Amino acid sequence: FKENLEKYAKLLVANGINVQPGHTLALSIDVEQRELAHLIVKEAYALGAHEVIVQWTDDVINREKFLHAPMERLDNVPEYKIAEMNYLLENKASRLGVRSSDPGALNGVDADKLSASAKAMGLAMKPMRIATQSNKVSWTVAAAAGLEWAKKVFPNAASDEEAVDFLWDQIFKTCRVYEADPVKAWEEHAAILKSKADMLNKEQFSALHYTAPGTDLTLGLPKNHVWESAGAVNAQGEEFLPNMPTEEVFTAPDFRRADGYVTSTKPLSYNGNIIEGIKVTFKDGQIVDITAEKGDQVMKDLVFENAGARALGECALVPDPSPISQSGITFFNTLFDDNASNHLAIGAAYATSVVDGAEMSEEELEAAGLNRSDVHVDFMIGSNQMDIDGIREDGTRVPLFRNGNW
């Protein structure tokens, strides 16, 4: 364990945040993971950082503040937290966020108090959100095996230690830690993901044809679409990885081009429900029927009660042989569950899925063919029996996936 956890640490500061000499790093991490934090701080200074600032998190104590503090302490952000953000901004600090996800960490908390805080914080920390969204500084989101998440992922474990050990093992396996040189393994894997995206971006397929057991579906793609995966580059030219781990290569379909049907292959976790065996039927871009062996009404309510929820906003590729795909585990954490399999999203497209989408207007994205909606629900459809062809503007079929792989 101590050996693997130190390899994890090194992987996060080299491929995740790419610490260089001179750098300031802000690490956001649970007090429960103090051992991983010691290692991250040690590896960060060894790559030359001049300062690592640890912003320690604790679910029990933050829940206390939310229960008891008066609204006046929640909707006013104290000046010292803005000064802290300004220090980080001025030193171009990288943001490494290592999260363990317990979903009922805020049980009993009033939604209005949470919302008041999220609003006041959302405004006061906007300079930090702009810097990270626009990639001015490097940032990575990763995971750590906290007790309450681990009990949720492995509710049948023999004990709490076991639940925790099984979750660490998943994290090490899916982040390539058991490899002899994880740093190298991720450099190589990142270049492969980026060459898939680059290949599909040079193709500019007109449509995608998927066939599998319970699936036959043609989805058209928007003109000037962008496939994204893997890493980014920050404002100083440094290569970084926003997510550890990561597999998918995704774009937006044209929301007014869809015919056929598709069945889900992996449990979907949505609003506290586990939904199984979904089958979606499309005609003219639109969902005309949706069913599930489990959570039927939830799925209907989703599509036939939310604006924009009768169309797709995302199509994503992931080899079936890849590590999350091969786990068979529901993690209830998007970082992992949305890298599990080929998938499609009900609802909103990401703006960056078309060229210059970041600048376009709401009316303009619609024009470009990107779905707008307030919901966005990714559901897995891939398996070792899925085939996919890209369809060129002149109907020529180019094989992309056979039996669930490139």
Ligand X SMILES: C[As](C)(=O)[O-]
If the CB atoms of residues 342 and 383 are measured against ligand X, the closer one turns out to be 342
If the CB atoms of residues 74 and 139 are measured against ligand X, the closer one turns out to be 139
Output the smallest distance, CB 68 to a copy of itself, in A.
4
Within positions 337 to 396, which residues make up the interface with ligand X, using CB under 6 A? 338, 345, 376-378
54 contact choice in Zn ion, a copy of itself, ligand X, none (CB below 5 to 8 Å, kind-dependent): a copy of itself
Output the smallest distance, CB 35 to a copy of itself, in A.
9
Within positions 313 to 332, which residues make up the interface with ligand X, using CB under 6 A? 314, 316
31 contact choice in a copy of itself, ligand X, Zn ion, none (CB below 5 to 8 Å, kind-dependent): a copy of itself
If the CB atoms of residues 302 and 316 are measured against ligand X, the closer one turns out to be 316
As a whole number of angstroms, the distance between CA 286 and CA 373 comes to: 14
Query: Which pairing describes strands 139-143 and 94-99: parallel, antiparallel, or unpaired?
Result: parallel
377 contact choice in ligand X, Zn ion, a copy of itself, none (CB below 5 to 8 Å, kind-dependent): ligand X
According to the binding rule CB under 5 A, does residue 314 interact with Zn ion?
Answer: yes
Q: In this chain, which stretch among 47-55, 170-178, 249-257, 394-402 interacts with Zn ion, using CB under 5 A?
A: 249-257
Q: Which helix or strand (DSSP H or E) is residue 147 part of? A: helix 147-153
SS3 320: coil
Which position among 4, 28, 75, 87 is part of the footprint of a copy of itself (CB under 8 A)?
A: 87
Size of the site for ligand X (CB under 6 A): 10
Output the smallest distance, CB 265 to a copy of itself, in A.
40
Which position among 16, 17, 18, 58 is part of the footprint of a copy of itself (CB under 8 A)?
A: 58
According to the binding rule CB under 8 A, does residue 60 interact with a copy of itself?
Answer: yes
> Phi/psi of residue 264, each to 5°?
-75, 155
If the CB atoms of residues 88 and 175 are measured against a copy of itself, the closer one turns out to be 88
If the CB atoms of residues 21 and 395 are measured against a copy of itself, the closer one turns out to be 21
According to the binding rule CB under 8 A, does residue 67 interact with a copy of itself?
Answer: yes
Q: Which helix or strand (DSSP H or E) is residue 140 part of? A: strand 139-143
Residues with Cβ within 8 Å of 269's Cβ and at least 6 positions away in sequence, in order, are 275, 330, 332, 337
Q: Which helix or strand (DSSP H or E) is residue 88 part of? A: helix 79-90
> Phi/psi of residue 93, each to 5°?
-65, 135
Burial class, 132, CB count within 10 angstroms (exposed 0-12 / middle 13-18 / buried 19+): middle
As a whole number of angstroms, the distance between CA 166 and CA 225 comes to: 39
Residues with Cβ within 8 Å of 138's Cβ and at least 6 positions away in sequence, in order, are 17, 18, 94, 95, 234, 238, 240
If the CB atoms of residues 49 and 249 are measured against ligand X, the closer one turns out to be 249
Output the smallest distance, CB 252 to Zn ion, in A.
10
Which position among 2, 3, 70, 202 is part of the footprint of a copy of itself (CB under 8 A)?
A: 70
Which position among 5, 13, 14, 37 is part of the footprint of a copy of itself (CB under 8 A)?
A: 37
As a whole number of angstroms, the distance between CA 136 and CA 319 comes to: 31
As a whole number of angstroms, the distance between CA 375 and CA 398 comes to: 32
Output the smallest distance, CB 70 to a copy of itself, in A.
5
Size of the site for Zn ion (CB under 5 A): 7
Q: With contact defined as beta carbons under 8 Å apart, do 348 and 371 qualify?
A: yes
According to the binding rule CB under 5 A, does residue 14 interact with Zn ion?
Answer: no
| CA 118 and chain centroid, separation | 20
User: Which residues of 144-247 form beta strands (DSSP E)?
Assistant: 207-212, 215-220, 232-233, 239-240
Residues with Cβ within 8 Å of 23's Cβ and at least 6 positions away in sequence, in order, are 44, 48, 49, 50, 92, 93, 94
If the CB atoms of residues 59 and 338 are measured against ligand X, the closer one turns out to be 338
Residue numbers of the site for ligand X (CB under 6 A)? 248, 250, 314, 316, 334, 338, 345, 376-378
Query: Which residues of this chain interact with Zn ion, rule CB under 5 A?
Result: 248, 250, 314, 316, 338, 345, 378
